[PDB]
């Protein structure tokens, strides 16, 4: 009994795909605030969630926003928050905390400029205090935003960890085609710091996920994969370093275009054990890479 | 199946009576941090709550601490936090928020000096932004700390409101006799801003509660009722102004001893429509009133 | 060398009068965030302050916003923040803190609905934890917003205390006539908890300020004084209780119209030692009292 | 006129060396809270700073703690805060903010277990939201804690940036010999996001600083350099990647012992462009590496 179309193609935005995906995954607690460009995730939840006997909690404070979800999670709910920019910085203690408690919870960081951007890749990985491991996923299309949100809620439960869906304003706002399956076509997974880290890092084979098929060629993520279309980075963390190694050997140079000053780049160069030149095509300040721009540069 | 004595007298501290009372009331979510003198409420919960299939959440941030409980409450749990001093100030937005959402949640403010004190009476009433109404209870004994905690959880549900149990370090730490009933001897109540305010303020007859029987005489709360033992103030808010009126007429002077510089005093003088002299015996800086001190002064 | 008109009448909004007044008073530190209806105070400061060799600090967090000003104050600056609604709740710990440290700082709480409102009168007085005293001023016109801001900065220094300028969206946004004096026509005052409280409360004769001249008659504050135009409440705290007493005797009934459910009312009834009937004309939900509405009711 | 010994050797703890160094550097604003093991930095400041006409501000909230210093800095003061663990997480937004504003301020993160630890190396670098660059220094001795604190205040001013002094509980608490120079033997430096990043990253030659002299050999930081005594890592960020490259070639294997699960390690492996095997000796859970432990393993 879902208040949106299921079992059929539809044309939705990112924020809406996420908000639909979450609900089908089992999430009946959302805690957030209307802020651009997450405020559409909010509106969708605010619209849909009361009609599925779920609850939306409009919290002022990002600190409070994430804490309420950790709290709903512990009282049994599947739960999510959503934020942007320096809000995401505010949530790092409670995220860190959710790591140690092995709390299932999903966080959406909708990246932004000031207009998409890709400058929270490292903070998504290392912003927590201490030794920790959590999962970070990066959607390149509106269909991936739908699918990864499902996967996030599934991973969050299976590995009893927070999951970060790391996206951008453009994927979030741009309308595209999403096939939304019927409820029962969807597998949903029901419900010291050495095992915590190993929980994640020893299972990259299950949690890591990449797209790329050019075995006969001489790497990006998010809204920059679509304009670079190539190695597709979907699972940002835990990160398969060896895979980048194997690909280093089989090619001459590895171009890493990002909307930052080098973050995805670093993991690539550390991945490529010297066995290929690694270069960054950085654009920042608003526009995604136009494919002519990535084109020329190479 | 409770991990502490039930259906029998026992001798416990305030923090322990509260922590026992909460659990018998149905609370299976506690979110707090060890701070004096609330850190004993924590320890007791941390000790007892895992053995009743409940959960304790050690949160750094008081802002986060209260938000997690609002969140657990909305996902269905009966929930409580506990705090002291400027922590209580931090929780005022989320409390205010719990008021508007009509969220059942219980908050313990354990008052302090720097050593009890009584300087959060007004902040308990008016610290929220806006127009609101919530309930505030004040225990004078260890048995009242037990009983009011029960009543708090019952009122919180019935009137769908936050309830503040406003206590002090001394009541909290001092060992006294508590009769703890057996589980089934306890009635527990299962689960715009004009009706909100009226919800509470129109039902003072049910929510207001005082102790005093001297119809032949010529007023305090908390640890200061025991040393003044008299009108006993138990329900601080919603406040029965008329009752203080009726008592004004029947007496000459009304002495209001508090451990502050006048807070309970003000409600008394506003209650006494001029119909009696109202005077405050203020001691602050550590010790409760020794009854000799209240004695002399009158 | 001021980047706005001085020594002459002009027609400005509230937020602009405040922002002009502050600068003439000596304030060279403002820390805030653009939020309605304080975001105009911000814009004005952001516009004017760089041209007077001052500094504006755009802080996300209201907690941080007030802390930065307490910090600038201690490093020697005259300083101010500005906020609205549940933001004001967030600042209560740091305000409380500024009280104990005897820190000069000015805070503007721009009251709001959801559209003015008057529901932070009590929170302005009692939202701090503990025993404290601070000053609260209430402007009824755009000229009073200018003048009280000056007075706030002067009182803040003289009594080494925080000062709260408690205003509303309407006074803030409405254009009126302000005479702005020339710089040198303005007197500006250069730079335990028992003396703190007495600092303020023993000097009501200097800090308290009211407007009303009807000795031959049979009381409001803010945007509701202009529509009730009568006793004008300008200094909200410290509060002259005796004055309301003297006025109680000389009249039959005292009407207290507020945009809340009774806050100014309570101080009035406690002021009137029974010696006059006290009644509240409460409107909430948007519009100020239209004078026909206050008119009929009486 | 300094209230501690100058111009002579003395034997002090880390927290005391830091607190002495800061004052000699020109810092007259400290804002913090007593927490282990930073609470000694506090006590020292609280003791010394009033006697140099400076100010210490005891703030509850780490968010507020850092904001007050950013604020004091902007009103002209040289300023510092100090924190530990999830406190450091709370400060990431305001740090990020200090980056964009090009605010000189110094932050001490005293690393900890639960007992030193080294699990905030990455968070020190990448915990800010967005694209940014700041400086991070790591003291290995009590004399380096003194000296780097000086250098921090000097770098903070010269590059108009926040500086993070990244230390640990052990260096902080352990007594050692510090030569404290006389005041005038100390050079102190008086007072978009593409130039910000380049400000730092283009000047590694001045900001980067390492200790190691074994050109005839076949790498650690903090309390783990002393027990590994070798390449000494002092400037953690901006990081000289090429230097690690040059050292990779000249040796067979590079052992990176840390008290974490690999953080310093990653920068090393990314530094070593495949040109040497890189291995981590991780101990976590309390004790520093005993040199026998690092010894055996190799």
PDB file of N, CA and C in Angstrom, chain C residues 4 10 14 75 123 159 174 181-182 199-200 226 253 259 288:
ATOM      1  N   UNK C   4      26.432  55.786   6.650  1.00  0.00           N
ATOM      2  CA  UNK C   4      24.993  56.011   6.578  1.00  0.00           C
ATOM      3  C   UNK C   4      24.749  57.433   7.050  1.00  0.00           C
ATOM      4  N   UNK C  10      15.742  60.300   9.162  1.00  0.00           N
ATOM      5  CA  UNK C  10      15.741  59.418   8.006  1.00  0.00           C
ATOM      6  C   UNK C  10      14.588  58.449   8.231  1.00  0.00           C
ATOM      7  N   UNK C  14      13.324  48.591  11.264  1.00  0.00           N
ATOM      8  CA  UNK C  14      13.813  48.275  12.595  1.00  0.00           C
ATOM      9  C   UNK C  14      15.223  47.705  12.565  1.00  0.00           C
ATOM     10  N   UNK C  75      38.222  39.699  24.351  1.00  0.00           N
ATOM     11  CA  UNK C  75      39.414  40.259  23.717  1.00  0.00           C
ATOM     12  C   UNK C  75      39.297  41.784  23.488  1.00  0.00           C
ATOM     13  N   UNK C 123      10.993  33.695  28.570  1.00  0.00           N
ATOM     14  CA  UNK C 123      12.252  33.034  28.280  1.00  0.00           C
ATOM     15  C   UNK C 123      13.379  34.045  28.296  1.00  0.00           C
ATOM     16  N   UNK C 159      26.952  48.035  33.651  1.00  0.00           N
ATOM     17  CA  UNK C 159      26.643  47.015  34.625  1.00  0.00           C
ATOM     18  C   UNK C 159      27.346  45.725  34.279  1.00  0.00           C
ATOM     19  N   UNK C 174       9.106  47.237   9.698  1.00  0.00           N
ATOM     20  CA  UNK C 174       8.294  48.391   9.337  1.00  0.00           C
ATOM     21  C   UNK C 174       9.102  49.687   9.272  1.00  0.00           C
ATOM     22  N   UNK C 181      21.138  61.047  15.603  1.00  0.00           N
ATOM     23  CA  UNK C 181      22.012  62.158  16.009  1.00  0.00           C
ATOM     24  C   UNK C 181      23.417  62.096  15.417  1.00  0.00           C
ATOM     25  N   UNK C 182      24.161  63.193  15.516  1.00  0.00           N
ATOM     26  CA  UNK C 182      25.560  63.144  15.123  1.00  0.00           C
ATOM     27  C   UNK C 182      26.338  62.479  16.232  1.00  0.00           C
ATOM     28  N   UNK C 199      23.510  43.818  41.519  1.00  0.00           N
ATOM     29  CA  UNK C 199      24.016  44.761  40.522  1.00  0.00           C
ATOM     30  C   UNK C 199      22.852  45.333  39.720  1.00  0.00           C
ATOM     31  N   UNK C 200      22.012  44.421  39.256  1.00  0.00           N
ATOM     32  CA  UNK C 200      20.880  44.768  38.441  1.00  0.00           C
ATOM     33  C   UNK C 200      19.696  45.135  39.318  1.00  0.00           C
ATOM     34  N   UNK C 226       1.773  50.289  20.179  1.00  0.00           N
ATOM     35  CA  UNK C 226       1.355  51.215  19.119  1.00  0.00           C
ATOM     36  C   UNK C 226      -0.115  51.015  18.714  1.00  0.00           C
ATOM     37  N   UNK C 253      -9.584  48.439  36.539  1.00  0.00           N
ATOM     38  CA  UNK C 253      -9.072  47.245  35.871  1.00  0.00           C
ATOM     39  C   UNK C 253      -7.822  47.590  35.056  1.00  0.00           C
ATOM     40  N   UNK C 259       0.711  39.472  22.442  1.00  0.00           N
ATOM     41  CA  UNK C 259       0.642  38.421  21.435  1.00  0.00           C
ATOM     42  C   UNK C 259       1.259  37.091  21.963  1.00  0.00           C
ATOM     43  N   UNK C 288      -1.009  41.582  14.598  1.00  0.00           N
ATOM     44  CA  UNK C 288      -1.028  42.391  15.814  1.00  0.00           C
ATOM     45  C   UNK C 288      -2.471  42.683  16.148  1.00  0.00           C
TER      46      UNK C 288
END
